[model samples]
Target: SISKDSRIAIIGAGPAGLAAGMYLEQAGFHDYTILERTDHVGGKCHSPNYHGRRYEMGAIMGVPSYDTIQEIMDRTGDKVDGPKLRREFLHEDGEIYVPEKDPVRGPQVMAAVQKLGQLLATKYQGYDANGHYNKVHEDLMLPFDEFLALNGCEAARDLWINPFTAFGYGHFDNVPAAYVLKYLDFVTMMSFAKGDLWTWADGTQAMFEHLNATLEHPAERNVDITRITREDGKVHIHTTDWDRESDVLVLTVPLEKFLDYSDADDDEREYFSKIIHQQYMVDACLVKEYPTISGYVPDNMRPERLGHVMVYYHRWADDPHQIITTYLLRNHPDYADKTQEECRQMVLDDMETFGHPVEKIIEEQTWYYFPHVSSEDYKAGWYEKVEGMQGRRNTFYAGEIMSFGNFDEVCHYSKDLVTRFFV
Candidate 1:
């Protein structure tokens, strides 16, 4: 049990870590510290300024149903206001490609997608909400392709490709259906379909940055955590700066690397080792391009085009010099690995093919995006066993993997974790 008197320590200063601090304070528990290994907050929400405006290196936009993020912004007094985002489908050759569907497939695809929405609303009503093992059907354990095929919604796969695969979640042939479905839940899908979205004017990172600054308790940045352990009913954290013992611990860093900084038990090692993430890359460049708007490459959205540029966006439509960004993945199970430079060149080459000439480079980031488990592990009670161990050794887990990787899912899970355990 946690009390307001507990001297708590949280690891990582990303959305997960910072959001945990917010919830802990709201619960009237303020004796806590957030330790970040990096100098910045908002893990992947890396928004840097360019010519008086901000552009994103990660997490571009959110749907209106992202109530958790809205709530956090409300408390911080940062409005969820930004330019409305819209995307156009373009060919690899930069052609203004229109949908190729006609009579035979259009209606079929619509019916299938509608049915998919209905099934989720009825059979899996709470699947979109916190945690996976609780509401997901066993069939969702299948790869996304198989899941769609099993439900006779194969036609809907094409529609999901732009949002799922192009957004760096990986191809449907690999990721589990639970990842895809939970990511594009009914309300969020409706928001996107309805052309309603929420972006931060100061960039998504600005929201978390403001959040950390405005919150009563701010994170200690540039921390180097040597180790974390449980001793004598206390959570011990050793850092380059100092060593301290807290009454409780909350780990918001990626579980894939949790053992590196913690003396984890065998139970944790087995579960943690099974988690995997794909390498998603983002690049911001000064561009002279055709179609000065956000574009999703339907052609490059396949697993075969794993290392190719799948999506690129123009942040400010009014400014020709706005930082245009490109997104792609580096690794695929079937293809050989490509170096970082090689992948960046691939994006550049793709842009050139699309009649976009990029003469100067700004910044590039490679992220361990979307931490998730395989179907085998998920079906084997992975979440159940992990959640079962919550509060054992005075440590609790909260982060992207707890639910989905988006802001609402990640932050809400942290909020609810405080309510369920910390409060």
Candidate 2:
């Protein structure tokens, strides 16, 4: 299928690459190839099988603000599964706890609800000259110390720090107040638009199925592109899987991995070295069944019980076996010596503290975990560096990192990038 114009090659099969390919093909650029080094597409949004169910180890949730993603999902007739769930709390008897009453649905939490409302209002109005909202807010990203001081809720900070950093962003303090504000704003908007948060029942892989189906030209996977060079005003690409040429090229891998190729420039090379030092970790998934005392339901369905999800001072504990269990959305670190069974036991023990007898009907379990960011991260000019990429050598980079902790935000950013391309 080689032609004088069929010289475009896309690197990386993540959302950004796949999305770009989709757009290019729509524009009648049908001869280009999509080269994903992996065996499949979907990049970070991919799900792998573990235990009986498929577990999303990377980029788990997508909010409603991602209109482009929704459009793609809708076109593919993908069903968005609902009533987002959470872990209620940790009990004394090794059972994960949920409140008998509704926490978010009740009247007593009205004041907190109103505070959230006003916070949203201020956010909608944007920040004032003082960089302060009309009222204080809990969801606002603040310095770890300042956040604790404002809420006088220092008691929860220790418990919240680890998992929040683990799952949400990579580090506790690296995320700024603005970043936190944007997250809260995004979740609020999504809640209004989608009626409730959702995930794919079959996993996010369904989204990719739809994406691939739209391709007039089949995407190329498991192809390792080795070089991209210009010859006689045309771009030539060499790959282990196939040798071909392209008029344009899109690089979508992480900056660290992408710089290894000789095609990159000095700026690309220096930027990668500066950014690669950042590190995060993901742990394996643990699935287990524990016995319940009375009734047990996931946290989101029983929002009335605010304490269903429990947090602990994981760092202060001596027994190494005392694993801290909290809301499922919360993140935990990769344990050093803890076996998967031991980690499962630790999670069960934390649940027991909340009131469940998890030791009774224990069925099976596994663990899934990873790191996203670190405290030493948060470069002084990170935004400027990212923004500068625009119009620079027709280069564009997009991913979960570009959107902070929200995948939906990344989709929106991708759409904006495409819009800019046309401009």
Q: Tell me, by lDDT, which candidate is best.
A: 1
lDDT of 1 by residue, 1-423 (tens): 488899989898888888999989988998989999988999988889989999999987888777888888887788867777878777878777656355777788788889998888787666665766474788888888888888888888877777888888888887888888788876666677676877878999988998999777799998898888897899888989998899988988898698888888999998999987879998888887545567888888877777788988867878787788888988766677678988888888988987777777789899988888887788888889999999999999878777877777889888988888976
Error of 2 at 68 (Å): 2.2
> For residue 201, what is the lDDT in candidate 1?
80
RMSD (Å) per prediction: 1.4, 9.2
How many pairs of residues collide in model 1? 0
Cα-based RMSD of candidate 1: 1.4
The candidate scoring highest on TM-score is: 1
| Runs in model 1 lying further than 4 Å from the true structure | 133-135
Model 1, residue 136: displacement in angstroms? 1.7
